[PDB]
Design a protein around this ligand. Structure first.
Ligand SMILES: Cc1cc2nc3c(=O)[nH]c(=O)nc-3n(C[C@H](O)[C@H](O)[C@H](O)COP(=O)(O)OP(=O)(O)OC[C@H]3O[C@@H](n4cnc5c(N)ncnc54)[C@H](O)[C@@H]3O)c2cc1C
Length: 462
């Protein structure tokens, strides 16, 4: 393997104390930057939470209470009835499968942009008028048969034609793009071998990428489970050297900060952009498959996890990786995917003075990020930050929704998730937007060393 490929492999399941200790001084915000990130994060999270005055209203409720909850309700029901007395004088003087299917569809609706690419493309004008951008995700993954993969191929091809016509020359930055999953383009990808992936999957990836280039829209390769990282790099490496793609910078690639390999993957990507003479569109995410990654490692009984076991470590990893990406704007267009107010504010500060549109963009999932990003994308005059956000827009029917929805349920329902915590009016804003580096050092001082694994998540062999 090349030097940078070797380093990736060696870091696969690096001990957490060692990986976190390494990332820490790379992720640490210089003092004035930390202060500004904190102030901005606090302000974003304050507006997000208290837009319709949720905390003030909760603090009138508690302030009334000397009664019980359900009691105070009884009173309000009465006070409401009294306020419906028109005249104040009078007032004063006085099966299992189908249950799961329905619940999925009902909870999943909010995360879906449209049933078909045409409906999706139509629902996007409203936010596009405001400076938002889109990346369309034709739902459907883990193709089991040759036929399934073929259908996904056809669906992607048709989406590119529709998106590309809608883009009408706006280009890879200002115009919409598409996101694809490699698992959709090859039967039984989860266990597919190198030779068959190259022989069958690659011609599909190349074909779609060339079509995306013809319309000049971005084409992003989503990141999936950790044991597919390697083959996805081999596929990316070959793609970047196609003569037909020379001089074109619309190839996009996701990297997952929850993996120990992430910074090493960045070193590889930097070298690849250099050798293949292009700017790569790189989406930095934390990661969508954490629960399954943990479970898989525990069943396979290997020496360690390929992901961090404490959420704060992933946050620290994201910040370190963000700095690495921002240091090479000639080689990488970073796309910072997050719904976390601190993370956003930190990136905003880390990106430095003198923003220009092609420096970087934020990204968010449809149904999750719009309220936060409504403070971000737009004009300074309107009280926004004037930073563009690209909305990830799932497209498809109920038959294609299950796996995506489950990942959204895990993301939204986890007590460690920012989106879950901000919805807790009890949890103070300062804790919500607490600096992850400082949080890691707190743990270290309490525990006896830096980057210990989650106490409840022993090594697979233990
Ligand atoms: C536009 C967009 C595209 C994305 N594309 C992909 C993709 O192609 N592939 C992919 O894997 N993910 C992808 N993601 C990420 C995933 O879908 C989540 O949205 C993202 O991880 C949430 O991060 P955060 O900064 O919003 O939230 P936060 O609440 O800040 O962070 C939550 C994340 O922390 C991580 N985490 C949770 N618990 C632990 C723990 N105990 N130990 C270590 N880490 C933990 C998980 O990654 C979790 O998602 C994408 C996200 C966005 C917004």
């Amino acid at each position: 393997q090349s030097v940078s490929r070797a380093a990736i492999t060696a870091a696969y399941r690096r001990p957490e104390t060692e990986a976190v200790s390494m990332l820490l001084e790379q992720a640490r915000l210089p003092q004035p930057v930390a202060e500004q990130a904190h102030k901005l994060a606090y302000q974003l999270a304050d507006k997000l939470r208290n837009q319709k005055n949720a905390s003030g209203r909760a603090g009138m409720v508690q302030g009334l209470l000397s009664l019980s909850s359900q009691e105070g309700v009884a009173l309000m029901c009465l006070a409401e009835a009294l306020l419906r007395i028109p005249d104040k004088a009078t007032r004063d003087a006085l099966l299992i499968r189908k249950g799961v299917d329905m619940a999925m569809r009902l909870m999943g609706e909010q995360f879906v942009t449209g049933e078909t690419i045409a409906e999706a493309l139509a629902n996007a004008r409203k936010l596009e008028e405001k400076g938002f951008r889109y990346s369309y995700d034709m739902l459907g993954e883990a193709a089991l048969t040759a036929a399934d993969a073929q259908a996904y191929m056809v669906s992607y091809q048709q989406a590119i034609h529709a998106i590309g016509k809608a883009s009408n020359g706006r280009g890879i930055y200002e115009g919409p793009g598409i996101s694809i999953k490699l698992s959709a383009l090859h039967p039984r990808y989860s266990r597919a071998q190198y030779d068959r992936v190259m022989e069958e999957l690659y011609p599909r990836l190349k074909s779609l990428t060339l079509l995306a280039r013809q319309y000049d829209i971005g084409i992003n390769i989503d990141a999936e489970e950790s044991d597919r990282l390697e083959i996805s790099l081999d596929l990316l490496e070959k793609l970047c050297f196609e003569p037909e793609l020379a001089g074109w910078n619309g190839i996009g690639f996701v990297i997952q900060a929850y993996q120990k390999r992430c910074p090493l993957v960045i070193d590889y990507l930097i070298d690849l952009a250099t050798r293949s003479r292009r700017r790569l569109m790189i989406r930095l995410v934390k990661g969508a498959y954490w629960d399954s990654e943990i479970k898989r490692a525990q069943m396979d009984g290997l020496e360690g996890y390929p992901v961090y076991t404490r959420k704060v470590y992933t946050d620290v990893s994201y910040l370190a990786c963000a700095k690495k990406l921002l240091a090479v704007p000639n080689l990488i267009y970073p796309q910072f995917a997050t719904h976390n107010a601190h993370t956003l504010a930190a990136i905003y500060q880390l990106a430095g003075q003198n923003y220009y549109p092609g420096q970087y963009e934020f990204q968010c999932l449809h149904g999750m990020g719009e309220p936060l990003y409504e403070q971000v994308t737009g004009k300074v005059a309107d009280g926004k930050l004037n930073r563009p956000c690209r909305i990830y827009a799932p497209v498809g029917t109920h038959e294609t929704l299950l796996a995506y929805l489950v990942r959204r349920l895990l993301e939204n329902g986890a007590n460690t998730s920012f989106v879950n915590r901000i919805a807790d009016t009890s949890l103070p804003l300062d804790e919500l937007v607490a600096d992850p580096v400082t949080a890691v050092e707190k743990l270290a001082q309490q525990e006896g060393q830096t980057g210990l694994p989650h106490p409840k998540i022993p090594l697979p062999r233990d």
